[PDB]
């Protein structure tokens, strides 16, 4: 971890390429919509917290969902199901023990049945051809976080929060690779708490100069600013807990100095 780090970081960059949705996927879905997906991920956040699940779990879940939706038309009645199975699976993949299936059925207002949720699990696996260890933003933040000097909880929680916020809006967050969004979120969080910036250590590791971030950075800012007003709130809620240092309270900069 002090030896592979680079090997790892290299490989995640390689992986994040192969594990990528298609960007245009939402407009080719007859019956559903970026909005609809927002409602959904939001819901997952909330499940996240109810069952007290690691954040990576939720990041995985969305990633699965996004690729599942990039091959398979779904009807709006069945989205919450896809989400439920995506969540079940990731919990099975990343948690020490996962909620039972019963709970996952419960949490939908028994709108679907155990055998329904279990059937979809399977189809989802089928469709991802079992490829589940997708690199996420939350992974690259954690790699990134090594290069703080020094460390700072506020910064970390903040970068996290922005990370999750990116989860919610396929537009334009799907055109960005996680490693990038994770940079973006990192520089913004840095910037916001301490006025510092995306460090040379990381620029040299990541090959990402600040300027290469700017596109992604900008959307993310816009988002940070608008989050209190966003149609969808479960995250801001989440990131009030003192577990996360109140960071979703803190005041967004109105400018970035770019």
């Amino acid at each position: 971890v002090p030896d592979y780090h680079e090997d790892i970081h290299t490989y995640l960059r390689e992986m994040e390429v192969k594990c990528k949705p298609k960007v245009g996927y939402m407009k080719k879905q007859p019956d559903i919509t970026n909005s609809m997906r927002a409602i959904l991920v939001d819901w997952l956040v909330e499940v996240g917290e109810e069952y007290k699940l690691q954040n990576e779990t939720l990041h995985l879940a969305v990633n699965y969902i996004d690729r599942f939706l990039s091959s398979m038309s779904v009807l709006r009645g069945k989205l919450q199901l896809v989400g439920t199975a995506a969540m079940l699976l990731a919990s099975k993949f990343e948690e020490i023990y996962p909620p039972e299936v019963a709970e996952f059925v419960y949490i939908t207002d028994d709108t679907y049945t155990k055998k329904q949720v279990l059937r979809m699990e399977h189809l989802v696996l089928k469709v991802l051809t079992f490829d589940l260890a997708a690199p996420t933003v939350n992974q690259f933040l954690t790699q990134y976080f090594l290069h703080q000097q020094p460390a700072n909880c506020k910064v970390e929680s903040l970068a996290m929060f922005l990370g999750e916020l990116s989860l919610i809006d396929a537009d334009p967050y799907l055109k960005y690779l996680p490693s990038v969004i994770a940079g973006a979120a990192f520089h913004l969080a840095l910037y916001t708490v301490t006025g510092q910036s995306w460090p040379e250590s990381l620029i040299r590791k990541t090959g990402y100069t600040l300027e290469s971030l700017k596109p992604c950075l900008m959307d993310l800012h816009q988002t940070y600013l608008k989050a209190p007003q966003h149609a969808q709130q479960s995250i801001r809620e989440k990131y009030k807990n003192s577990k996360y240092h109140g960071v979703s309270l803190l005041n967004p900069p109105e400018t970035l100095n770019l």
Binding site: I32, L40, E46, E49, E50, R76, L79, Q80, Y106, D109
Partner: peptide, 8 residues
């Protein structure tokens, strides 16, 4: 939270 039959 939580318990929810998302209407779309």
């Amino acid at each position: 939270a939580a318990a929810r039959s998302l209407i779309f």
